[PDB]
Enzyme design. Structure first.
Site, short mmCIF file in Angstrom:
data_model
loop_
_atom_site.label_atom_id
_atom_site.label_comp_id
_atom_site.label_asym_id
_atom_site.label_seq_id
_atom_site.Cartn_x
_atom_site.Cartn_y
_atom_site.Cartn_z
N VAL A 169 9.38 4.55 13.45
CA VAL A 169 8.25 5.64 13.53
C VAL A 169 7.39 5.45 14.90
CG1 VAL A 169 6.23 6.93 12.86
CG2 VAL A 169 8.10 6.06 11.26
N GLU A 205 11.46 3.24 6.05
CA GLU A 205 11.31 1.55 6.29
C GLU A 205 12.18 1.49 7.55
OE1 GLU A 205 10.12 -1.04 5.11
OE2 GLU A 205 11.46 -1.89 6.59
N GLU A 251 -4.15 -14.71 -4.37
CA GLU A 251 -5.13 -14.88 -5.53
C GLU A 251 -5.38 -13.45 -5.95
OE1 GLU A 251 -6.13 -16.10 -2.33
OE2 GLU A 251 -7.63 -14.79 -1.57
N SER A 255 -0.13 -4.29 10.81
CA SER A 255 0.34 -5.04 9.72
C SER A 255 0.06 -6.47 10.07
CB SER A 255 1.87 -4.84 9.81
OG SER A 255 2.61 -5.86 9.12
N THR A 263 -6.87 -8.24 0.01
CA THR A 263 -6.41 -8.48 -1.47
C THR A 263 -5.54 -7.40 -1.71
OG1 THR A 263 -8.33 -6.99 -2.06
CG2 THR A 263 -8.77 -9.35 -1.80
N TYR A 307 -17.20 -10.00 0.76
CA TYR A 307 -16.95 -11.07 -0.41
C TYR A 307 -17.96 -11.66 -1.25
CZ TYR A 307 -11.87 -11.62 1.19
OH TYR A 307 -10.73 -11.25 1.63
N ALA A 317 0.73 -1.28 0.06
CA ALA A 317 -0.04 -0.09 -0.01
C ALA A 317 0.54 1.40 -0.17
CB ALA A 317 -0.84 -0.03 1.20
N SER A 334 -5.13 -2.75 -0.85
CA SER A 334 -3.97 -1.73 -0.37
C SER A 334 -3.70 -0.86 -1.73
CB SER A 334 -2.79 -2.81 -0.06
OG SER A 334 -2.48 -3.10 -1.41
#
Lengths: 579, 579, 579
Positions: free
Chosen positions: A238, A58, A70, A280, A495, A189, A35, A499
């Site tokens: 962070v 990072e 998928e 996360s 999915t 879904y 994302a 993101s």
């Protein structure tokens, strides 16, 4: 009203103007996930922001398979992004071009889906075996408003017939649901993939990359961003972002970071955008080997700590404790990947999946579900090789089990206590390999690396509206929330589309880019799609066969066919083979 | 099959493989119309055919406005084509990029739509004034199969309540229907533009180019084709193409042409593709001037002769006599365009259209329908100037009349007998200009050029299935029919989309280009679109106000709302303000 | 939104922060009217914009009273503005301080209101003489939604009984209504001044300045603005403002001005604010003398031309033709001011108004209505002297007539054809002066200056919603509309409050100043005020006397007093002397 949803080819190929005051704007992006990098690519391409003004923060300084990737054709925001991204394998083509050309010459489909009793295919494979009450509960779930489903579990809306159906077996394993998960997210879904119900059992509508998504998606985006001069800062941890939430507006004022062990601050203006990937699902992932189990843990990492620090400053920044706390111990925790070149394991696999694993083409078509396993083990083999330096004689499979606290069939231990070989021990047990040559193959001819993700089922935890922040929160000026934990409209978490979609919505709202964000596909609102869903859900049955037993429904059906005789509706009914 | 329909962003941005044996294939294209040039661009771009293998055969060697060039956003095939076409006005942008940016900084909308009694706006403007019986006939037209509508006139399906409505005034003039036209083609417009019913009266859904379509569309395509080395042959008059029809396949063997007066032949192999634009609506167009009327004619041109020659070779090449013969004399034949710089003509328009015609922006927003006129005159003024060298103080308006054999109001002559000023005489009369200074304004202060198209209503003629050939006929190898007279699925003639779509379907079927042709938009099968249509058709009325008079509908509705109380359907009903 | 309505002492004394990015913003203000200068003072004070960045554009280069400038205590936005404005008469005090101190030592009240039969006071003075049906129509008007009153005349909602009442005599003369005026605007006055119904006949709630508003309000504001260095440009005639109305936002791009006869342009950014006073009620005002009538005209001036040019660019910039066109010829057009020092005219005035005109205090308390006059003449005398250089022995009165096309009683000519003396001729006739010494007093002892305002009744013309632009139009960035012709919420036109309120709303919305705009006073929503209105409207009558004749209303009243016996409601009823 800083954005508008659109569809069709007009807004797809249209490029927007450079938005105003961009040359005085900067962007700080926390994390280098999917994302985060997607938002960085939208800023370069659609926002026309120069690369020196974008900073990627990072955590990390400068064979494991993360399965479940998928993809399907209607990932509208993903293919909008992966259009300008040049590929790294073939020249003069995009990432979409490789993905398009590879999935048209080698279509993905599974000739075996569910196996039980140590090797035998399920007799009722392909069929859904949904009762009329079970189909009724599916329609009732789809027809309930999303606001009425706050903190509603799956078991609160479904009955025993639905869970005993083959539909729930396919559903719970593709998307890794659990019975104690969010009914809102399941309802999304059902509405999102209503146009793929026919290709649900055999995985005909699924599309896969040539390699893992790190090298198929992230590495092309990293190379694209570095070609534009995007600043990557490493070793930046962070802690929190200082937000002043006034009565009229919210501004990210200052970010407290730990740059290479030195705690210091970066100041922000209203122009300096901040994109936060709150939460996360791979955070605090402990690893194992073939000999020792992956040690269980529940330590909150940097991404969850950042969200928890942000959630204090405003109530509409979300409740991270609804996701990262009180995860049931029965939930999916352990995933394993097994690399081997032993021939008779491959032959045992080939006897089940009916295809050559070393052929270089589609091997399993997706996942294989062990129905009789107490672990509810499911395994998949993708297009070998999934890795660049992986030898051509080796295959790599991916094994995960939904239930965690229950003892397995071959090994009377929970999956959390099993070492790498012991996971491979029971995997070979359910493939039909005899109980004599099973032990030495896993311990010596196979290498299994378990991984313990404690937060891999967070996005499906039961939630209410407002537990997830909006992509750009109300009255926000330079703060945006992206990733799987940011709330957006009608789209589905876990999915690669979600993101990227939240990345696109954040960039478009903050910069006021005048271009339509492609809406989530209108499959639930299509007559043709809904008619195919009715045919497929009751196992390829006509309207007369659906209501062949109930006298009241047949009477209303008989009157209905009289009113539409020789009309366009009847032609729709015939051409979708519902007549 | 040879093609498949697709939608979404997956097949939109995907570039197909170079199809097999293309470097040994050539293409001969008859005509230089929009459909012919679009097919040449698709062969260059999507077929990857080198430009030397593509031949354009043009009749002609080497201010008038051909109006009716409405565009809307969901012309899916048109924006697919005008993506790679670079523009000639601004740099580093496409034709769509200009089109997108110009219709966002100057949206199209009509502040006045219908006028009557010599200048005054119609009092019921904006409303549709459709009775319940009229709306019933609209839906019954949509709900009849297209096969059951062979040779069925508009008057055969509609009654006097529909024709007396403001809806029919808007409908008959936007698309230039006549009451004796094809019900199939009207039924296609109803389903195609069902999502534009809210923006039907005020033209908010229409889009326009900066100039006339010759310079905004054709010239960018011509310059694009010339940069790729496409060979343009001029002075080529095609008599017929030798087609041998076997029981298995049909091959274009030989084309008989008259190259600069020299009758000769060009050989064809199976690799040599032939694209025929059968029929033409601008063929045999006689022109007039400010003093002499455009001389009426019924002479068949080269295109209609070419189709008539081909139709004798095979029964499934269509029947051109169903379109080019027996056109009723009351039908639209004469179009006029009037260029003036006179202030009081402009100021009269400024009082009607509520906008400054010389401002360089939207002027009339589309057409203005003269309701009381016997000619059913309708005039439009686009973004002046529509031409390059036209002086900045001149406007150029476009006038057409539907009925042709009836005497006008200010001039008791039919439109076919009126000179250029005399058309401008009656146009100024219906604008409310005083009948004393009207004579010298038309004769001396204005320049009007009439044009007589004898086949401008051919595509709307009553027809059966098979009257128009398929884009690629069944069992054909190198022969394809493009343009407005080739039969395709669910799409609408006399739009720039249809000619481009038939160009794409022809190139993709003949070359076996494995890329999804973007289907006609799914508006008629969308719940959200249909629900907005119900609200807008009966003039912004809820379900309770629609059924406030009939007891049968009221009783069924009350039981219906109890069954959807507090469901997602009710939320759909309220958000589309039907509840 | 960008503003919020507030009330009380918290937001009154609160100063807001300096809003963001103000030091890079500028403001261009068209006109030097009350609304324009009020917006300039709000920018200096509340917006903290420095004076060099504010430009005032005035058309003009560097014994007439424009009466009707009634004021009351609840002009919330006016006293917010006239707080920081220092006065010019007394030191160390504000304009409000003079206005407060002067109106508390000399309270305004009228001892005579309506006279008839040439001098005699009306016998039913003070009473309203409203029938029960007439009061019912007042309540029905107040209870209708404002959106339901589009283009509704006063006669469309009222009957014969209402116009025959003394209430309509007071109402039509204070505010200068006509029977063909807007019912929306009358409904706003009924709701706005519902708390002053008791002080309606005797003018006890009205407040007046020491002088005319030019030196009482405008000159203190001019001196305040010039002390801050506000740039005044003179001889600047604004033709039009170039507006580009996109689909997403509206920006004033460029202003075409005629600076001292030289036509040139000033460029604008998004930061450069533009404040437009669309329309003007004093525009094209021709003046007369004692000997010749003021020449009638209807020529559109600079302010109306600017609005007409702006109205073409967008439909939500208003329809100026609903106000400046088709004004009925019976409407108020001519106003006259008469200056004299003749003693017996003063004595005749003193015999009617019961106060000394040369005393230096309140003279008439407001206006005096001639009921019998066919002109419906009304005259007022304010606190003499209204002018500094005016001699102390002279008084200056203000005369206007509502009907214009009807012959007067003393002079059988319309007011539009009467010279200055002839207006003074009939004014002395209705004061009871003998018909012999009347002629030489007006011609020789008096000086009457007529003035013909053709647009003095524009704001009351019948309108629909959207005919007036919003103060800041939707999606506008630097364009704001101020003055009496800009649409705002619940407030009333032709008041000094409305022009200042629209000035405050424009500055606060454009600059995003975070401070509550004081709402229009909540008098219609107050129980105590509504109870006083019921008592006053039916001529000081208790609930038992109101329904003493109707048996149906008495029955509900009898049960009502049983339910509230010995409660707080009964104490409210008694203390407002309704019970």
């Amino acid at each position: 009203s800083h954005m508008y949803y659109s569809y069709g080819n007009y807004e797809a190929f249209a490029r927007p103007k450079k938005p105003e005051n961009v040359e005085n704007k900067s962007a700080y992006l926390i994390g280098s996930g999917l994302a985060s990098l997607a938002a960085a690519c939208f800023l370069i391409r659609d926002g026309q922001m120069e690369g020196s003004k974008i900073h990627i923060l990072e955590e990390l300084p400068k064979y494991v398979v993360r399965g479940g990737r998928e993809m399907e054709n209607h990932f509208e925001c993903l293919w909008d992004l992966f259009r300008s991204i040049p590929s790294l394998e073939i020249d003069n083509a995009s990432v979409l071009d490789e993905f398009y050309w590879l999935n048209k010459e080698d279509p993905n489909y599974s000739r075996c889906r569910v196996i039980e009793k140590q090797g035998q295919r399920l007799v009722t494979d392909g069929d859904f075996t949904l009762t009329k009450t079970a189909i009724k509960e599916i329609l009732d779930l789809c027809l309930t408003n999303e606001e009425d489903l706050d903190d509603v579990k799956i078991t609160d809306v479904f009955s025993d017939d639905f869970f005993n159906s083959n539909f729930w077996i396919y559903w719970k394993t593709m998307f890794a649901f659990e019975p104690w998960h969010s009914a809102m997210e399941m309802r999304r879904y059902l509405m999102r993939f209503v146009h793929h119900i026919s290709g649900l059992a055999d995985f005909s509508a699924l599309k896969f990359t040539k390699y893992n998504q790190y090298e198929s998606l992230v590495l092309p985006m990293v190379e694209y961003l570095k070609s534009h001069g995007v600043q990557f800062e490493y070793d930046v941890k962070v802690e929190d972002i200082k937000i002043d939430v006034t009565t009229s507006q919210k501004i990210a004022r200052e970010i407290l970071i730990d740059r290479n062990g030195n705690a210091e601050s970066i100041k922000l203006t209203i122009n300096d955008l901040v994109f936060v990937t709150n939460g996360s699902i791979t955070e605090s992932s402990t690893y194992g080997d073939n000999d020792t189990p992956a040690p269980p843990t529940d330590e909150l990492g940097g991404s969850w700590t950042l969200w928890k620090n942000l959630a204090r400053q405003s109530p509409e920044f979300g409740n991270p404790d609804k996701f990262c706390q009180n995860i049931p111990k029965k939930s999916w925790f352990v995933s394993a990947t097994s690399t081997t070149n032993n021939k008779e394991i491959i032959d045992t696999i080939e006897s089940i999946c009916k295809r050559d694993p070393l052929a270089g083409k589609t091997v399993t078509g997706g996942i294989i579900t062990i129905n009789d396993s107490a672990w509810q083990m499911s395994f998949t083999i993708n297009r070998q090789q999934q890795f660049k330096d992986q030898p051509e004689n080796e295959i790599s499979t991916w094994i995960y089990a939904l239930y965690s606290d229950v003892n397995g069939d071959y090994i009377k231990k929970p999956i959390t206590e099993c070492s790498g070989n012991e996971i491979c021990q029971e995997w070979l047990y359910h493939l039909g390999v005899s109980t004599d040559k099973i032990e030495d193959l896993a311990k010596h001819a196979s290498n299994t690396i378990p991984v313990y993700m404690p937060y891999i089922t967070s996005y499906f935890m039961t939630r209410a509206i407002g537990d997830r922040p909006l992509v750009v929160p109300h009255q926000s000026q330079n703060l945006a929330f992206i990733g799987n934990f940011a709330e957006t409209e009608r789209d589905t978490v876990f999915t690669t589309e979600y993101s990227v979609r939240t990345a696109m919505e954040a960039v478009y709202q903050l910069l006021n880019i005048d271009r339509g964000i492609p809406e989530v596909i209108n499959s639930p609102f299509d007559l043709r799609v809904l008619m195919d869903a009715i045919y497929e859900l009751n196992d390829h049955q006509d309207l007369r066969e659906i209501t062949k037993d109930s006298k009241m429904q047949k009477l209303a059906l008989a009157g209905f066919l009289k009113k539409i005789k020789g009309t366009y509706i009847e032609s729709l009914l015939k051409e979708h083979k519902l007549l």
